[PDB]
Design goal:
Blueprint: E1 2-11, E2 14-19, E3 22-25, E4 29-35, E5 43-44, E6 64-68, E7 72-78, E8 81-90, H1 97-101, H2 107-119
Parallel strand pairs: 1-4, 3-8
Antiparallel strand pairs: 1-2, 4-6, 5-7, 7-8
Bound molecules: chloride ion and copper (II) ion (CU).
Copper (II) ion binds next to strand 8.
Length: about 120
């Protein structure tokens, strides 16, 4: 299955958001990150992807597709926008949950990640 995440200046969560900011997918599913507004990108957060996964980074304004196969959670962020974060989950019982949940980001970033994990049933 293929899924889309839009990069937006504003959403229910406030300014600078991935929408949806949380997505549960099956191994082999894909997510394309699509800038609805200019000035955004996507990249994985250091330490926040599974063993077996590769990091990634898009260019500002680039439409960017990633295939997810390694099971676990994947924290992603937008470079210019500190609170702009999201979580892609592959499978159930992710094994690297604490990598995201136990991290020490600025509060508004960390609460958005934490909300994303809780919405994914964790
Ligand atoms: Cl593009
Ligand atoms: Cu952004």
């Amino acid at each position: 299955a293929d899924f889309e995440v839009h990069m937006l200046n504003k959403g229910k969560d406030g300014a600078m958001v991935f929408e949806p900011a949380s997505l549960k997918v099956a191994p082999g599913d894909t997510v394309t990150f699509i800038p609805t507004d200019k000035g955004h990108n996507v990249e994985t957060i250091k330490g926040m992807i599974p063993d077996g996964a590769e990091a990634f980074k898009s260019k500002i304004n680039e439409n960017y597709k990633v295939t997810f196969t390694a099971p676990g959670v994947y924290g992603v962020k937008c470079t210019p926008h500190p609170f702009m974060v999201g979580v892609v989950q592959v499978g159930d019982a992710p094994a690297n949950l604490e990598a995201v949940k136990g991290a020490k980001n600025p509060k508004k970033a960390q609460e958005r990640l934490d909300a994303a994990l809780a919405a994914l049933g964790n």
